[PDB]
Ligand binder design. Structure first.
Ligand SMILES: O=C(NNS(=O)(=O)c1ccccc1)c1cccc(-c2ccccc2)c1
Ligand SMILES: [Zn+2]
Length: 273
């Protein structure tokens, strides 16, 4: 171990995927030990165990803006909770090749997804978002920790990010480049959402209509619809072209059959800043 290559967080030991610039001294130990509630990183099992008996945090800081049953989202502003956000960024960089910002967190707001039991709210993943995005990015980085990947939580967070964009009356797209798992996940999310809308209306949904209803950009609707072969091109304009039956054929594919953890807008508490 000369870079950090293994973390212990909660009950999980996880191998790193990429370099993250924890301080040199921390990379020297066999494992880096993180408090799963405050995200403090520690060099020894003994300092970790002492910290677990002392730390009073049982959930992320900031404001719980979503709660439904034992699923919750906390909104944490990088200026109000700098240390927690820097800790989160160095933890994320272990799984993200392309994240480059770890310390200058004050331009960002972080949305932390947790799953709650009688012990406290256990981190699953997060996304960051620029407070002011000139490019209309509604996610900067998005990361689900390995033991929760491919289990519905990424789909919930991507949906969540578009729920905020809807409340802001704006469209938005993730910042590129996307990670490999992020690309597959966005493509599957957009397809599901657009197909479900195409099934529910009939029904002069234009591409514009779909962008207003979903907060998905026109370009990302178009590239999705191209991949489904649901668009024709006429004198310089992409136009929707699909039958009710074709929409149902798509939606009967294994990929759309897992039951989603849904985002209930009744349980989201948030207004634009
Ligand atoms: O877990 C995921 N997706 N699988 S899923 O079951 O939630 C899903 C997502 C979208 C559509 C269907 C299912 C997921 C989604 C978005 C990002 C990441 C990720 C994790 C680590 C490093 C970089 C990115 C994973
Ligand atoms: Zn702690």
């Amino acid at each position: 171990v000369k870079y950090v290559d293994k973390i212990h967080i909660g009950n999980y030991e996880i191998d790193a995927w990429y370099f993250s610039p924890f301080p040199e001294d921390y990379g020297k130990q066999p494992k880096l030990w993180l408090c799963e509630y405050c995200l403090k990183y520690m060099k020894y099992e003994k300092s970790y165990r002492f910290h677990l008996g002392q730390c009073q945090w049982r959930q992320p800081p900031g404001k719980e803006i979503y709660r439904k049953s034992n699923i919750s989202v906390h909104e944490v502003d990088g200026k109000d909770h700098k240390i927690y956000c820097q800790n989160l960024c160095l933890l994320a960089k272990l799984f993200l090749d392309h994240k480059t910002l770890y310390f200058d967190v004050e331009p960002f707001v972080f949305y932390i997804l947790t799953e709650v039991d009688r012990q406290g709210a256990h981190i699953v993943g997060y996304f960051s978002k620029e407070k002011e995005s000139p490019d209309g990015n509604n996610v900067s980085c998005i990361m689900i920790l390995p033991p929760y990947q491919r289990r519905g939580y990424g789909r919930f967070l991507i949906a969540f990010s578009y729920e905020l964009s809807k409340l802001e009356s704006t469209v938005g797209s993730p910042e590129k480049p996307l990670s490999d798992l992020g690309k597959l996940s966005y493509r599957s999310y957009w397809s599901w959402v657009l197909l479900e809308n195409l099934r529910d209306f009939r029904g002069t949904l234009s591409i514009k209509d779909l962008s207003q209803m979903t907060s998905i950009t026109q370009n990302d609707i178009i590239s999705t619809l191209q991949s489904l072969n649901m668009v024709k091109y006429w004198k310089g304009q992409h136009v929707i072209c699909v039958t009710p039956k074709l929409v149902e054929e798509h939606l009967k594919s294994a990929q759309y059959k897992k039951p989603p953890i849904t985002v209930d807008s009744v349980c989201l508490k948030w207004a634009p800043p």
